[PDB]
């Protein structure tokens, strides 16, 4: 729900997010949506080859929590994963966030 928060795409479901990413997205494009299975939290949905990825972001007492990392704002979370991988395979393929889907 946040107004005045350009990081927030919308309250699209997982399947609706997959459709938008496949229809208009390029590798590295992503969107941030409410989580369907944990409604007070968020999901980062990433356009990736083969199968798109979805990552959990918990909002706990103002702090944005992803994996073992903590960020004061969603914007800083996004900036971190533009330069550090958000996903690494066991064979070394790394994925980064590039830009928000419009």
């Amino acid at each position: 729900g946040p107004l005045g928060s350009p990081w927030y795409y919308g309250k699209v479901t997982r399947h609706q997010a997959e459709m938008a990413l496949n229809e208009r997205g390029h590798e590295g494009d992503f969107l941030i949506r409410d989580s369907e299975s944990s409604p007070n939290d968020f999901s980062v949905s990433l356009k990736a080859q083969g199968k798109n990825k979805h990552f959990k972001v918990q909002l706990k007492e103002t702090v944005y929590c992803i994996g073992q990392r903590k960020f004061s704002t969603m914007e800083e979370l996004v900036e971190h994963y533009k330069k550090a991988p958000i996903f690494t395979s066991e064979q070394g393929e790394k994925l980064y966030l590039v830009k928000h889907l419009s």
Partner: peptide, 9 residues
Amino acid sequence: HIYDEVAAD
């Protein structure tokens, strides 16, 4: 709904 693992840190 299974979520993908975030890269280790």
